[PDB]
Design an enzyme around this catalytic site. Sequence first.
Site, PDB file in Angstrom:
ATOM      1  N   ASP A  61      -4.754   6.164   3.567  1.00 41.34           N
ATOM      2  CA  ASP A  61      -3.754   5.228   3.052  1.00 41.34           C
ATOM      3  C   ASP A  61      -3.793   3.870   3.756  1.00 41.34           C
ATOM      4  O   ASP A  61      -3.363   3.743   4.905  1.00 41.34           O
ATOM      5  CB  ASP A  61      -2.354   5.851   3.161  1.00 41.34           C
ATOM      6  CG  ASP A  61      -1.260   4.974   2.565  1.00 41.34           C
ATOM      7  OD1 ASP A  61      -1.562   4.103   1.723  1.00 41.34           O
ATOM      8  OD2 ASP A  61      -0.084   5.166   2.937  1.00 41.34           O
ATOM      9  N   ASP A 115      -4.275  -1.212  -1.524  1.00 43.04           N
ATOM     10  CA  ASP A 115      -3.608   0.022  -1.110  1.00 43.04           C
ATOM     11  C   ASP A 115      -4.237   1.278  -1.719  1.00 43.04           C
ATOM     12  O   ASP A 115      -4.088   1.544  -2.910  1.00 43.04           O
ATOM     13  CB  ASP A 115      -2.113  -0.059  -1.449  1.00 43.04           C
ATOM     14  CG  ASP A 115      -1.314   1.121  -0.915  1.00 43.04           C
ATOM     15  OD1 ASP A 115      -1.896   2.015  -0.264  1.00 43.04           O
ATOM     16  OD2 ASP A 115      -0.088   1.148  -1.152  1.00 43.04           O
TER      17      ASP A 115
HETATM   18  C1  LIG Z   1       5.515   7.673   3.383  1.00 50.33           C
HETATM   19  O1  LIG Z   1       5.236   7.268   2.043  1.00 50.33           O
HETATM   20  C2  LIG Z   1       4.722   8.149   1.124  1.00 50.33           C
HETATM   21  C3  LIG Z   1       5.593   9.038   0.492  1.00 50.33           C
HETATM   22  C4  LIG Z   1       5.120   9.948  -0.447  1.00 50.33           C
HETATM   23  C5  LIG Z   1       3.765   9.965  -0.759  1.00 50.33           C
HETATM   24  C6  LIG Z   1       2.885   9.076  -0.138  1.00 50.33           C
HETATM   25  O2  LIG Z   1       1.551   9.116  -0.466  1.00 50.33           O
HETATM   26  C7  LIG Z   1       1.098   8.750  -1.770  1.00 50.33           C
HETATM   27  C8  LIG Z   1       3.362   8.157   0.800  1.00 50.33           C
HETATM   28  C9  LIG Z   1       2.382   7.205   1.474  1.00 50.33           C
HETATM   29  N1  LIG Z   1       2.362   5.808   1.026  1.00 50.33           N
HETATM   30  C10 LIG Z   1       3.149   4.996   1.957  1.00 50.33           C
HETATM   31  C11 LIG Z   1       2.820   3.536   1.648  1.00 50.33           C
HETATM   32  C12 LIG Z   1       3.169   3.210   0.199  1.00 50.33           C
HETATM   33  N2  LIG Z   1       2.810   1.837  -0.102  1.00 50.33           N
HETATM   34  C13 LIG Z   1       3.710   0.854  -0.137  1.00 50.33           C
HETATM   35  O3  LIG Z   1       4.784   0.894   0.448  1.00 50.33           O
HETATM   36  C14 LIG Z   1       3.331  -0.361  -0.952  1.00 50.33           C
HETATM   37  C15 LIG Z   1       4.035  -0.323  -2.304  1.00 50.33           C
HETATM   38  C16 LIG Z   1       5.317  -1.145  -2.275  1.00 50.33           C
HETATM   39  S1  LIG Z   1       4.974  -2.822  -2.868  1.00 50.33           S
HETATM   40  C17 LIG Z   1       2.441   4.182  -0.726  1.00 50.33           C
HETATM   41  C18 LIG Z   1       2.792   5.626  -0.366  1.00 50.33           C
END
Ligand SMILES: COc1cccc(OC)c1CN1CCC(NC(=O)CCCS)CC1
Length: 370
Positions: free
Chosen positions: A37, A221
Amino acid sequence: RGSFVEMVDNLRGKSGQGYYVEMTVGSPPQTLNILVDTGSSNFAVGAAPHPFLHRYYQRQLSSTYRDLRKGVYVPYTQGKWEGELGTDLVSIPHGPNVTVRANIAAITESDKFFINGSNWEGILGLAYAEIARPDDSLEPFFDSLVKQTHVPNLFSLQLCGSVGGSMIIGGIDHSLYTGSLWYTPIRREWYYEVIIVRVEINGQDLKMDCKEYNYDKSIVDSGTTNLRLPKKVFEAAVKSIKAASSTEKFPDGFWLGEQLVCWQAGTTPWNIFPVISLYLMGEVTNQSFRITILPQQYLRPVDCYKFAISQSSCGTVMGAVIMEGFYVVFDRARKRIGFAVSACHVHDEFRTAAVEGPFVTLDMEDCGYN
Ligand SMILES: COc1cccc(OC)c1CN1CCC(NC(=O)CCCS)CC1
């Protein structure tokens, strides 16, 4: 430098569920599958017997674990994860032949974090300390890796849309891309923030103010599935996609992601859907380049397909939709991100994903939101 045969095909995943790499934590090594990620900065792994988990981090079995005596709570839109902070020996079997002491958030309580039926047990935050939780003092894994070893401050991702791919740690593999690499500056070291300076729908400009394309921010991302677009940009983009694909009929809820569209096997009309070009700020003043994605990228199979372009309230997110067409180089050393046509991307005989340049674009600094 240039090859890295050990790291090729070291990623696995399911469509819409993200890409994971095999990692080991502690000693003796405890093997876990860890979601890659670039949109977060925490190395967090399941540490308790959650029903959805194949396995979990067992700190009592590790002789090299060190407790930090600190807790971390990470909430988001759907749910949360909470964990206990510590450090241990972390390694990547199909990566560089090194072992580092990195921070690990041992997840003890979570809501809507782990996926039922998924094959991953944690998350590898590859972004910068600025967006790390609880604060910027907790060193992210890659920062620890570079500081403790001779591994160069660089990684690259080839995501191929069972799904697979490659994460090359410490360099670039030239077999994983065709043509030339084109670099866009990382605007600020928190998220992998870039600047979009122009958007075309099938070679047609949206004529919007370029500051809108980056309203709040624009990021690369690997943890997000969709290509997320700002509300004003999404509204304009869909309108142009709707008009370009008027030969076939689609329900209104499909473009909002409230419904799926299905076709018979092999009867999916690709030609009716437009290509999407994103012009990114270049390395030189007034110089840009463009990356072009196919309907194969933004129509994700669930033949039933979901519209993988969505409205966002947090800026442009270049998710797996964008990344699956390209070999992406996170050149942390030079504060830039490289794009090249992926050797593994899904394409037909008619149209192919492209990275083209240079182009002339003035006032590119005005596209960045303040
Ligand atoms: C802790 O977050 C979770 C929770 C559940 C599933 C998951 O894995 C897909 C994650 C991991 N990941 C964190 C970062 C997130 N990206 C952003 O915040 C950018 C988008 C807003 S403009 C994408 C999701």
